[PDB]
Design a protein around this nucleic acid. Sequence first.
DNA 1: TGCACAGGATGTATATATCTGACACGTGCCTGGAGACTAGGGAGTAATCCCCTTGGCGGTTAAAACGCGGGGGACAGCGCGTACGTG
Length: 49
Amino acid sequence: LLAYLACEKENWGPHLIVVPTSVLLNWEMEFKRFAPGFKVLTYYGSPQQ
DNA sequence: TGCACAGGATGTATATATCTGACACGTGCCTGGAGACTAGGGAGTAATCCCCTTGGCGGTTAAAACGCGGGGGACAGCGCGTACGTG
């Protein structure tokens, strides 16, 4: 659906997912596996990183 | 002539009468001791409601705890001289 929004319209936008802490890496690995052309960030190291 | 002696001329602690100072006793007018009336402030109670607990599982995060390197600062040793101790 997010890859459909990039090709259907010109809206890309900064998106947001809310994942549990155990499946945090599977969405990044799935984002590199499926639909590579998206820029994805993650969230680790709350006080410093 | 050199020498001991008897009595006076001054001292000196000793005992006695005398001068302050503080403890002890005998009063009386501003205090207390006590009797009665008032009453409002203190002792007692009936809901109340409201924030304050009761007990313990996990997940995760930010704070607390440990560990080593070493660098610079506490700290000991020692000579000087002038600044207060002593007369």
